[PDB]
């Protein structure tokens, strides 16, 4: 029935804590944060050049050089100061930076039949096999190697190799014809040659009306087989200023939240007086520690981010015309956002522990304990066949289809097939004799397993009531 559980004090204080935690989490986001990533993602990607080369259309090296000297400069260095303002309001912080990662000349020895037609051979990228020598004119910074310690940077687990953070870089100058001449000098000399493996272009924009940084990087990968694979990453950062009244209200909510997590951690460590008895047996006494840990790491990252953004903006206003690394801050800010979302989810869940609802919910965890030992004998018997199917799909398709191109992608593709979201035509075109067979038999197996476990569940209670009525 609808009745309040344990106490009327803890319920009220938890309601207060929930309102506070759901007000200090929605106060670090922006309503116009989705319209900023769409206006900046359609300006730099969907903008065709002459000959119609967007960013997502880049498919060779000549296409890369038509995109670089075309709609990349026309979008960075806008038209009608000493500083550039994209769309009359946005401010381009620092200076962009092209960065390239090469691969050594002799790393992938050729076969015996071809070693008179193909002299030297360039392997796929690997930090073991990487070129660290000057090339081209061997003159500037775009033709010599600078390690990851000089170029303060970090790995980029982007696609196929988790690329490093060093390489051959060039910081575009302030003007537009100056940077156009720089890129022309980089094209006439062969910057992109057989040894190139990846090229990053990263920069950052700041809007003033809304206080938002849009930090965007564009990666182009040149596989060992020629071609390109353009990908991108566009993120947003807040940089809350403490000048409004709402900002001081948010500071108040933050200090209240700190006091709340302290009171909850003391209330948790106090009831460990039941040293091991009934403590780590209850399930809620794991959710409490989880939300405590998450709420601690939250303020940890908050302090760190304040310090880092202060340092970065100081370095920027100290000496412009140099790359200001914002990628670290943006990446870890998105991690912080995800952690906050999960913490809010758990804090919303605990209300069920605090207040009881219809008898259905109170007996739901009693229903779950019915399939006590049937499920561990079902999980294995289902996952064995699930992974057999996953790798069968990876081996039949996976050269043609994209969703099957690797193992974990097969796992998630099958998990989506369960949810009624599939693309049967690509499967069929990949192999029109073992495609339909795979699809049909997989769906039949899933339905069979589901029906079987349902039969087991509702056959458990028959035997239960039978033995309890005749016992």
């Amino acid at each position: 029935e609808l009745y309040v559980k344990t106490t009327l004090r803890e319920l009220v204080v938890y309601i207060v804590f929930l309102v506070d935690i759901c007000l200090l989490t929605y106060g670090m986001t922006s309503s116009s944060a989705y319209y900023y990533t769409k206006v900046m993602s359609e300006l730099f990607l969907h903008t065709p050049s002459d000959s119609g080369v967007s960013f997502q259309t880049i498919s060779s090296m000549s296409d890369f050089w038509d995109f670089a000297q075309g709609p990349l400069l026309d979008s960075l260095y806008w038209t009608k100061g000493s500083h550039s303002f994209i769309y009359y309001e946005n401010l381009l912080l620092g200076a962009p930076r092209l960065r390239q990662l090469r691969v050594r000349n002799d790393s992938c020895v050729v076969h015996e039949d071809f070693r008179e037609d193909i002299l030297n051979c360039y392997d796929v990228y690997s930090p073991d096999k990487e070129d660290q020598l000057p090339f081209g004119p061997q003159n500037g910074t775009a033709w010599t190697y600078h390690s990851q310690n000089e170029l303060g940077g970090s790995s980029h687990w982007g696609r196929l190799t988790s690329y490093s953070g060093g390489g051959y870089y060039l910081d575009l100058p302030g003007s537009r014809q100056a940077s156009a001449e720089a890129l022309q000098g980089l094209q006439e000399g062969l910057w992109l040659d057989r040894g190139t493996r990846v090229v990053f272009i990263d920069f950052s924009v700041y809007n003033a009306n809304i206080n938002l940084f849009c930090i965007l990087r564009l990666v182009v990968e040149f596989p060992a087989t020629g071609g390109t694979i353009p990908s991108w990453q566009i993120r947003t950062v807040k940089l809350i200023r403490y000048v409004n009244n709402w900002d001081f209200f948010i500071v108040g909510c933050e200090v209240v939240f700190c006091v709340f997590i302290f009171y909850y951690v003391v209330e948790e460590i106090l009831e460990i007086h039941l040293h091991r008895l009934r403590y780590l047996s209850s399930v809620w006494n794991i959710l409490d520690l989880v939300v405590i840990l998450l709420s601690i790491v939250a303020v940890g990252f908050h302090i760190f981010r304040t310090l880092e953004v202060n340092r970065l903006m100081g370095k920027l206003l100290q000496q412009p015309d140099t790359y200001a690394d914002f990628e670290f801050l943006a990446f870890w800010q998105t991690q912080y956002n995800n952690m906050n979302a999960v913490n809010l989810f758990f804090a919303w869940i605990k209300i069920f522990k605090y207040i009881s609802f219809n008898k259905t919910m109170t007996q739901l965890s009693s229903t779950l304990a019915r399939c006590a030992k049937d499920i561990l004998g079902f999980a294995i018997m289902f996952f064995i066949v699930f992974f057999a199917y996953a790798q069968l799909g990876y081996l039949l398709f996976g050269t043609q289809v994209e969703n099957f191109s690797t193992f974990v992608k097969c796992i998630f593709t099958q998990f989506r097939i369960i949810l009624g979201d599939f693309d049967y035509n690509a499967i069929d075109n990949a192999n029109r004799i073992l495609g339909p067979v795979y699809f049909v038999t997989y769906v039949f197996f899933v339905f069979f397993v589901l029906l079987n476990m349902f039969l087991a569940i509702i056959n458990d209670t028959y035997s239960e009531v039978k033995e309890e009525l005749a016992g």
Partner: protein, 451 residues
């Protein structure tokens, strides 16, 4: 007894159903295909002159004396271009640099100006100058609720009407003098057309809103109204309209007499609340439906008097939308009545054998659904709210989660973006729903076996 009630209710549903004419759809679509051509390619403030010189002027004066495109739709009165600004306090950002900007909303700059935006010359307000904030009342306007605003009313106004040359002159004169600045907020282009093949008055408004980041969200809004006569149709509908309204007034008399032989204790008898709200709503519908036409005729007399001046039909269209909402309410009232008179004259239970309609069970179910929707909607809006559009806000996320429940919206972008978080959340949702239905099954098994 009951025969007259079921006949009257069937006639009422006939009334609310028979107000259907598909000619109102195509009209809209037609106009929307002409003026919305190359409209989204406007991202600046100087990209509206070339868009209104080959996509607006040709489609507004389509080689006919008055008619918009391919005759048909007539062009009533005159075209209006309105603009709302913000005060020119960009003197503080001498270069639009990065500081503690955004003063308190820069409420609409309602002050006069001069040749350019040069300070004014006198202290009076002219009604014919492009550089004078006119009014909301003296303009006879209405707050155009855009995409992210309300746009409380009037502003700085120009008229470019009735020829093609008299529009090119105005556009050139506005382009030279730099009328559209960086200080401009939303810009509206408004006019109205009357189609006489199918008697239908349409009002068109093209909206350009200035988002925070320098750009422009472009939208198009049309409102229609059928200006037919009292009858001008079949005798059946007319005979079905008069008989329904006399039945309505008879029922009004009946309930009035029932309420005089029962003075105040009539709240409990909910069988009369519906039958009196129905008569009130029917009378309101008829009254407003004729008042809209009276207003239209008044405004048309005003048009015939002093042709070649901008005329706004916002009042008639507002009354018409009120009539539409009244019909939408009357429909659900009628279905509730039909369903609660088919429960007594033929007892057909619905929730029975598992009713539990006390104040505890229903409230508890409502509460658990509300909590389980709010939690998932909030976390989905926080995780994928910056990239995906369906989870852009909180209520948008609630509707998207309900769609996920029904299967209408398929979650494949939440699996592409976050393959381990979104997958875990969907798995949790599936496990919860499966547990719920299995628990219902086992409870229904155990109640009817344990005795």
């Amino acid at each position: 007894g009951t025969l007259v009630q079921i006949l009257f209710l069937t006639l009422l549903m006939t009334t609310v159903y028979s107000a259907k004419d598909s000619s109102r759809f195509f009209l809209h679509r037609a106009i929307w295909k002409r003026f919305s051509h190359r409209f989204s390619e406007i991202k600046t403030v100087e990209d509206f002159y070339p868009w209104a010189n080959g996509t607006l002027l040709p489609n507004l004066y389509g080689d006919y004396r008055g008619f918009i495109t391919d005759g048909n739709s007539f062009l009533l009165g005159n075209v209006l271009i309105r603009q709302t600004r913000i005060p020119n306090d960009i003197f503080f950002p001498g270069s639009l640099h990065k500081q503690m900007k955004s003063p308190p909303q820069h409420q609409e700059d309602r002050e006069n100006y001069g040749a350019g935006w040069v300070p004014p010359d006198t202290n009076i307000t002219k009604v014919d100058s492009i550089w004078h904030y006119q009014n909301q009342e003296s303009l006879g306007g209405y707050p155009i609720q855009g995409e992210l605003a309300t746009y409380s009313g009037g502003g700085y106004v120009v008229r470019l009407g009735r020829n093609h040359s008299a529009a090119t002159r105005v556009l050139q004169h506005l382009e030279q003098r730099r009328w559209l600045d960086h200080c401009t907020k939303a810009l509206f282009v408004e006019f109205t057309v009357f189609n006489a093949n199918v008697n239908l008055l349409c009002a068109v408004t093209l909206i350009l809103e200035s988002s925070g980041v320098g750009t422009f969200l472009t939208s198009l809004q049309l409102d229609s109204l059928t200006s037919l006569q009292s009858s001008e149709r079949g005798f059946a509908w007319i005979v079905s309209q008069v008989v329904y309204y006399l039945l309505v007034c008879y029922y009004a008399f009946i309930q009035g007499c029932r309420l005089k032989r029962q003075r105040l204790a009539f709240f409990t008898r909910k069988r009369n609340l519906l039958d009196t709200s129905i008569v009130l709503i029917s009378f309101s519908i008829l009254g407003l439906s004729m008042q809209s036409l009276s207003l239209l005729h008044k405004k048309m007399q005003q048009y015939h008097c002093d042709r070649d001046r901008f005329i706004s039909f916002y009042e008639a269209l507002r009354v018409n939308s009120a009539v539409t909402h009244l019909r939408g309410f009357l429909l659900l009232f009628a279905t509730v009545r039909v369903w609660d008179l088919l429960r007594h004259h033929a007892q057909l239970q619905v929730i029975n054998k598992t009713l539990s309609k006390a104040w505890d069970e229903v409230l508890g179910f409502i509460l658990i659904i509300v909590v389980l929707l709010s939690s998932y909607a909030m976390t989905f809006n926080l995780l994928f709210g910056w990239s995906i559009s369906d989870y852009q806000s909180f209520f948008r996320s609630i509707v998207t989660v309900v769609g996920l429940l029904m299967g209408t919206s398929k979650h494949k972008e939440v699996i592409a973006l976050y393959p381990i978080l979104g997958s875990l959340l969907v798995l949790s949702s599936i496990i919860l729903m499966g547990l719920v239905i299995i628990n219902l099954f086992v409870s229904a098994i155990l109640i009817a076996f344990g005795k």
